[PDB]
């Protein structure tokens, strides 16, 4: 299609490897570009950790209000919110919000711990029917994004389907789903990524990710004004370990997708 030729050209112009999956929930049509290739998730994996905690809260009704101590030893490389609460506590809700809306890496590690390790995050993916997602490491080493390394990867197609289920479907309870949507809509890190390729009137909830090898990712649910929502996953990684982030590629891919709907 026109759209796949334009995405291939964008990819060729960028020097990297681009993976895209769009689900249009109006007709359940899908547009895929390298849709079954593995990409390093980097911080887009935080969505799965937060959703797993939300799932636990369907039975432990008070779980999100549970205080969790933030100690200096807990701090890793990027902790914009947890830093503000060292030697104090954050609730699991506050950690989930921090992980999602600020990409706080300490918060992500506390969510992983709450789930019993990376295996507990992966287990949740399996439980909701995602056989592709794998979380193997904690922060910050899950962002190494080494070419060919299957650790901490998923595919665009798999992540789109899973994001759809978590936000628009019923993999979570009604209150939990609404909370996740509210968290994603409040993301602060996304302005230059998918959002930048889309009409300003559209409502977007997204989670970015960044890592080594210039890895630059964004996964989004999109609510156009007067139109069924869309799920869009854009993954991008590059051949040089020290390559710079290319959020403009994600904006451009979103724009190409938006041209056609």
Q: Can you put this structure into words, describing what you see?
A:
It comes from Klebsiella pneumoniae. It catalyses: a beta-lactam + H2O = a substituted beta-amino acid. Keywords: Antibiotic resistance, Disulfide bond, Hydrolase, Plasmid, Signal. The structure is a monomer. With 261 residues, the protein is an alpha+beta fold. The strands form three sheets. A five-stranded antiparallel sheet has the order 2-1-9-8-7, sandwiched between helices. It has a two-stranded antiparallel ribbon with strand order 3-6. A two-stranded antiparallel sheet has the order 4-5. The protein has helices spanning 2-14, 46-56, 92-101, 105-114, 118-127, 156-167, 174-185, 247-258, and strands spanning 17-24, 29-33, 39-40, 67-70, 88-91, 153-154, 203-211, 215-223, 230-237. The protein has a single domain, classed as Beta-lactamase (3-Layer(aba) Sandwich), CATH 3.40.710.10. Helix 2 (46-56) runs antiparallel to helix 3 (92-101) and helix 2 (46-56) crosses helix 5.
Number of H- or I-type helical stretches:
8
Order of adjacent strands in the largest pleated sheet: 2-1-9-8-7
Which structural class is indicated by helix and strand composition? Answer: alpha+beta
Helix proportion range: 25-40%
The CATH superfamily is known as DD-peptidase/beta-lactamase superfamily
Radius of gyration: 17 Å
**Major beta sheet summary:** 5 strands, antiparallel
Oligomer designation: monomer
The dominant shape is globular
What is the beta-strand fraction? Answer: 15-25%
Count of beta strands: 9
Distance between the termini: 13 Å
CATH architecture type: 3-Layer(aba) Sandwich
- In the CATH hierarchy, what is the class? Alpha Beta
N to C succession of SSEs: HEEEHEEHHHEHHEEEH
PDB class: hydrolase
Keywords: catalytic activity, beta-lactamase activity, hydrolase activity, inhibitor, time-resolved, tape drive, hydrolase
Assembly: monomeric
Entry title: Structure of serine-beta-lactamase CTX-M-14 following the time-resolved active site binding of boric acid, 10000 ms
């Amino acid at each position: 299609s026109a759209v796949q030729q334009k995405l291939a050209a964008l990819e060729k112009s960028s020097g990297g490897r681009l993976g895209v999956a769009l689900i249009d929930t109006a007709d359940n049509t899908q547009v895929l570009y390298r849709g079954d290739e593995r990409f390093p998730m980097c911080s887009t994996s935080k969505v799965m950790a937060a959703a797993a905690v939300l799932k636990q809260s369907e039975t432990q009704k008070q779980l999100l209000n549970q205080p969790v101590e933030i100690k200096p030893a807990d701090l890793v490389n990027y902790n914009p919110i947890a830093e503000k609460h060292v030697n104090g506590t954050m609730t699991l809700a506050e950690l989930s919000a921090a992980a999602l809306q600020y990409s706080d890496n300490t918060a992500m590690n506390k969510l992983i711990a709450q789930l019993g390790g990376p295996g507990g995050v992966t287990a949740f993916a399996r439980a909701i029917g995602d056989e592709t997602f794998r979380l193997d490491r904690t922060e910050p080493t899950l962002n190494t994004a080494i070419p060919g390394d299957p650790r901490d990867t998923t595919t665009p197609r798999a992540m789109a389907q899973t994001l759809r289920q978590l936000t628009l479907g019923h993999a979570l309870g009604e209150t939990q789903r609404a909370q996740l949507v509210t968290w994603l809509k409040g993301n602060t890190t996304g302005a230059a990524s998918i959002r930048a390729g889309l009409p300003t009137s559209w409502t977007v909830g997204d989670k970015t990710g960044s890592g080594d090898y210039g890895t630059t990712n964004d996964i989004a649910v999109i609510w156009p004004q007067g139109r069924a929502p869309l799920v869009l996953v854009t993954y991008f990684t590059q051949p040089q370990q020290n390559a710079e982030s290319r959020r403009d590629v994600l904006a451009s891919a979103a724009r190409i997708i938006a041209e056609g709907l």
